[PDB]
């Protein structure tokens, strides 16, 4: 049907075939940066190199996607069925 609310899921992949711990360290600093920019996001680790970012307000998904892909350890960002880069 038609979605309720503004929440939005963002699926992120970490580069370099990292261990789960390294992925936790890498993504924790990303979450910190987002928070420091007033963004409200929850983080879920779902694999040695996979992370879920749950946005409270999905209307800011583009800004967050841009920030993430600009990181050296970000391989891909999946947003509404679309992978970035490119």
Structural domains of the chain, ranges and CATH numbers in brackets? 1-86 (3.30.70.260)
Q: What is the resolution of this structure in A?
A: 2.0
**Residue 36 class from Cβ within 10 Å (0-12 exposed, 13-18 middle, 19+ buried)?**
exposed
Residues 6+ apart with CB under 8 A from 46: 52
Please state the three-class secondary structure of the chain as a single string.
CCCCCCCEEEEEEECCCCCHHHHHHHHHHHHHHHHHCCCCEEEEECCCCEEEEEECCHHHHHHHHHHHHCCCCEEEEEECCEEECC
Experimental method: X-ray
């Amino acid at each position: 049907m038609t979605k309720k609310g503004k929440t939005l899921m963002m699926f992120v992949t970490v580069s370099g075939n990292p261990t789960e711990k390294e992925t936790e360290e890498i993504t924790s600093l990303w979450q910190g940066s987002l928070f420091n920019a007033n963004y409200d996001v929850q983080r879920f680790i779902v694999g040695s190199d996979r992370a879920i970012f749950m946005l409270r307000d999905g209307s800011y998904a583009w800004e967050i996607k841009d920030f993430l892909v600009s990181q050296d350890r970000c391989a891909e960002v999946t947003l509404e069925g679309q992978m970035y880069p490119g």
